[PDB]
Design a protein around this ligand. Structure first.
Ligand code: DAN
Length: 370
């Protein structure tokens, strides 16, 4: 009945003068340290988002523990008179440039307002850093160059939330997952769909990836063995929707509903997925974390997929945290102290009053595999 015994469990963000929701985790391999982002909201309500905070954590080897440095505001991540939300970090392994994509919405203008008004006022922004997050660039509002023509086709949009992807294609392309509320019917309300923002010139210029099966929300993507881009998305149904792309995220040919991966009643809850080298035919497996309770957001579980992307291959979950659990973001941290794949997990806990950092090896969560 207890949670899974892990290598680490520390509360990295807590309620105080501000509340903190919507976590993001980035593993800088050349540093052997993580970057944890989160929304610093004046309250726990979405419209009360304000800026994005950051904390750098450095993995100590002798102790197999991570040590976080004081939290700080990524002051640059924001547009004049706009709030910031949905941090989506990504490290370009080739140029060594750190990217932090985010959303900028005018003051306290709600999401709901944009939806029932069918008037998109959200803006796609990004900030870069060439010193591991120590200093950032001036914010770059990509709204025009990435969306442009389609901006009026959406009631509203958002990126992530969570870490992004960089394919191992000829050009090492950046893939920023997302979803959008598309105005398709004159009467029927706009239905959201997942999709990815693509870039093949290392952030110079972006492009919109094509949508997936209707009714998909926040999502994440991971690459796996020829070469595919599996995407896991939140849905208003009662289970996760996943899809595969064989053309580097430009289109998703296959799209199914995975019943083994449940979703809470309202409109589900953001979950997270990543891939890692396979311990033992396929070169990689997938790991996913999301609440396992079916009525509410609680009991964050970890799911394993040893035959990606076969839907039915997903495993039964393992309890990572008992009680109130919401959003989360995973990260492949390489080889763990016990020679198993190492994982870094950031998750929303206790009625959104703290964001917890979890660290465990594949051997701890899925011993059955060994
Ligand atoms: C950009 C934004 O406001 N995202 C919000 C998201 C969104 O409303 C839903 O995915 C429908 O699109 O919902 C939730 C949530 O706790 O479930 C918090 C997020 O901050």
């Amino acid at each position: 009945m207890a949670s899974l015994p892990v290598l680490q469990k520390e509360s990295v963000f807590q309620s105080g003068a501000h509340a903190y929701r919507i976590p993001a985790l980035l593993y800088l391999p050349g540093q052997q340290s993580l970057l944890a982002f989160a929304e610093q909201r004046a309250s726990k309500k979405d419209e009360h988002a304000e800026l994005i905070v950051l904390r750098r954590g450095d993995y100590d080897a002798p102790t197999h523990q991570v040590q976080w440095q004081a939290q700080e505001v990524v002051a640059q991540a924001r547009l004049d008179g706009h709030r910031s939300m949905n941090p989506c970090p990504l490290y370009d392994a080739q140029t060594g440039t750190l990217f932090l994509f985010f959303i900028a919405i005018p003051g306290q203008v709600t999401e709901q307002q944009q939806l029932q008004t069918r008037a998109n006022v959200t803006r796609l922004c990004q900030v870069t850093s060439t010193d591991h997050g120590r200093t950032w660039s001036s914010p770059r509002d990509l709204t025009d160059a990435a969306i442009g023509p389609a901006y009026r086709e959406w009631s509203t949009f958002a990126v992530g939330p969570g870490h992004c992807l960089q394919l191992n294609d000829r050009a090492r392309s950046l893939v920023v997952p997302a979803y959008a509320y598309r105005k398709l019917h004159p009467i029927q309300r706009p239905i959201p769909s997942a999709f990815c923002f693509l870039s093949h010139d290392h952030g110079r210029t972006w492009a919109r990836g094509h949508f997936v099966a209707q009714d998909t929300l926040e999502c994440q993507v991971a690459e796996v063995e020829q070469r595919v881009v599996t995407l896991n998305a939140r849905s208003h149904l009662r289970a996760r929707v996943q899809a595969q792309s064989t053309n580097d995220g430009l289109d998703f040919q296959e799209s199914q509903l995975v019943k083994k991966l449940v979703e809470p009643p309202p409109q589900g809850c953001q979950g997270s997925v990543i891939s890692f080298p396979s311990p033992r035919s396929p070169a990689q497996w997938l790991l996913y974390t999301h609440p396992t309770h079916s009525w509410q957001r609680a009991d964050l579980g970890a799911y394993l997929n040893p035959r990606p992307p076969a839907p039915e291959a997903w495993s039964e979950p393992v309890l990572l945290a008992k009680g109130s659990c919401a959003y989360s973001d995973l990260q492949s941290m390489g080889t763990g102290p016990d020679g198993s794949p190492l994982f870094g997990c950031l998750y929303e806990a206790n009625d959104y009053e703290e964001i917890v950092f979890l660290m465990f090896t594949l051997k701890q969560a899925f011993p059955a595999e060994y």
